[PDB]
Each structure stands twice: as C-alpha cells, then as structure tokens.
C-alpha cells in the first residue's frame, strides 16, 4: 500500500513476543509478581483489542488484563510525569526513591509500544493504527493508558510528586494523561499534597516557572479538590541527577 487505513504508526514489530518477554523479565526481577503467568497476561492483553474495531475500545476490554496485573505500589512514593519521562525514569533508577507507572508490570509491558487489531479478523495490524487526533480517541493504546493511569492515580497517598517539562509552552497541559486523567483521580481523602517539579530546559539563570500561568492553573485545580499544592524549580536537571547519585558532599 501507498496509503494506510489509519493515520498513526502500526503495531510495534514482534509485539506479541515483546510483551511476553517483558512480562517474563518483569516477573523474574520483581518478587511480588513472581507468580504471574505471562502467557495468561498476553492472552488477556490480546483479548482487549483483537477482533475489535480499533476505534471502539473501552476500559472494560482491558479489565481481564487489569485483574491479572493487580499490584501493590508504595502509595506515598508515586512519581507522575508529563513530557519528561526519560528524566523521571533516570531519577527512579538511582535508588528507587519513587515509582512511576512504568515501574509497574502493566506500564512496563506497554511503554513505548503501539498496537491495534481489526474488526472481525484476529490479525494484528502492523501497517497502521488510529491516531488519537485524526482518527479516534477510543483506540487500543489511548484507552490502555487512560485505564492504567487512572488506577495508578487512585492508588496514591500522602505526598505525590509530578515532573513537568518547563521547556514546553504548556508546562501543565490539561490535555495530557497527567492533566486529563491523573489529576482528577488522586483521592483527596488519601492525598495530602501534590508537589510539582518543574524541569528547566534552559541555559542557566531562568525564570521562576512555578509562577507560570499553567502552573497557577494546576494549583487552582488541585487546591479546589482539597489537596495542597507545592511547586519547585529544578534549574539544572543534570546537577539534580548527580546530587541524587552523590548527595551532600559536593555543591548540592
């Protein structure tokens, strides 16, 4: 074909093998998931989207998979992020000070992957998948992230942290998974504070981006949910990471 059905990239090559391998690796490393049957996880993941129209996926489709990937997360150590996932991951990798969604079995399985099927065939579509904007929001990938992110947000307690990209025109973006799902699913009964770390992209002596209009928006939203809001600038994320690996003895 010189023209594909959908406007988005197709399913990641060797999707089935990749998810299965990730499940095996995760369950080998993480002791609480030692007992998960990875074939069963693949079957349930597959059942969510195979033979279904990829513009008609619902959260219910992923419920078998959600049940299987049920997992306790230290509720007071959750790190959310938007448009800055590499630094979030590099940070949690140092000494596991916090946990992101990609530290969970389900987030790990799907990170950086694309997948979709076809109505009334059992084939995976490796040629194209729906674009969230051009085609439809109710596609297998978008629906998966909304489903898993909601559950992750509901599990948070105490002080919840979020890394935001301060080099974006919208540092807080109401359209992101963070802004459209996670903010609205933190449980005010459990969550005391949301603390945002605004990651600078700048060359040095930049603005206090905690005063950014979009940050004030996030503050208003979260305050009105009866959760406290805190914000900090991270001016030099390279120094930040160094200080995380090697604190207090040098210039930190």
* Residue 155 C-beta-side C-alpha neighbours within 13 Å: 20
- Which residues are bridge partners to 197 per DSSP? 163, 232
Alpha-carbon span 230 to 198, nearest angstrom: 11
Q: What is the 3-state secondary structure (H, E, C) of the chain?
A: CCCCCCCECCCCCCHHHHHHHHHHHHHHHCHHHCCCCHHHHHHHHHHHHCCCCCCCCCHHHHHHHHHHCCCCCCHHHEEEEECCHHHHHHHHHHHCCCECHHHCHHHHHHCCCCCCCCCCCCCCCCCCECCCCCCCCCCHHHHHHHHHHHHHHHHCCEEEEEEEECCCCCCCCCCCHHHHHHHHHCCCCCEEEEEEEEECCCCCCCCCHHHCHHHHHHHHHHHCCCCEEEEEEECCHHHHHHHHHCCCCCCC
Alpha-carbon span 228 to 93, nearest angstrom: 27
The residues carrying an active-site annotation are: 75, 157
Neighbours of 157 (CB within 10 A): 16
Give how far the C-alpha of residue 191 lies from the chain's centroid of Cα atoms, to the nearest Å.
19
Residue-range domains of the chain with CATH: 1-72+100-155 (1.20.82.10), 73-99+156-252 (3.40.50.720)
Residue 62 CB burial class (10 angstroms; 0-12, 13-18, ≥19): buried
- Structure resolution in Å? 1.7
Q: In the block, which residue shows the tokens 């805190």? A: 230
Contacts of 225 (CB under 8 A, 6+ apart): 183, 184, 186, 188
Method for structure elucidation: X-ray
């Amino acid at each position: 074909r010189w023209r594909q059905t959908w406007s988005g990239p197709g399913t990641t090559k060797r999707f089935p093998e990749t998810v299965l391998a990730r499940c095996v690796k995760y369950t080998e490393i993480h002791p609480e998931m030692r007992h998960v049957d990875c074939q069963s996880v693949w079957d349930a993941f597959k059942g969510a989207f195979i033979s279904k129209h990829p513009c008609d996926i619902t959260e219910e489709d992923y419920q078998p998979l959600m049940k299987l990937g049920t997992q306790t997360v230290p509720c007071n150590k959750i790190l959310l992020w938007s448009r800055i996932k590499d630094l979030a991951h590099q940070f949690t990798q140092v000494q596991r000070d916090m946990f992101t969604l990609e530290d969970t079995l389900l987030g790990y399985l799907a990170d950086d992957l694309t997948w979709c099927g076809e109505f009334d065939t059992s084939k995976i579509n490796y040629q194209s998948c729906p674009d969230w904007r051009k085609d439809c929001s109710n596609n297998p990938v978008s629906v998966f992230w909304k489903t898993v992110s909601r559950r992750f947000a509901e599990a948070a307690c105490d002080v919840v942290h979020v890394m935001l990209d301060g080099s974006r025109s919208k540092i807080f973006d109401k359209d992101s998974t963070f802004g459209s799902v996670e903010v609205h699913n933190l449980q005010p009964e459990k969550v005391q504070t949301l603390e945002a770390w605004v990651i600078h992209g700048g060359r040095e002596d930049s603005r206090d981006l905690c005063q950014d209009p979009t940050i004030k928006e996030l503050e208003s939203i979260i305050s009105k949910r009866n959760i406290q809001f805190s914000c900090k600038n991270i001016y030099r994320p390279d120094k930040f990471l160094q200080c995380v690996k090697n604190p207090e003895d040098s210039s930190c």
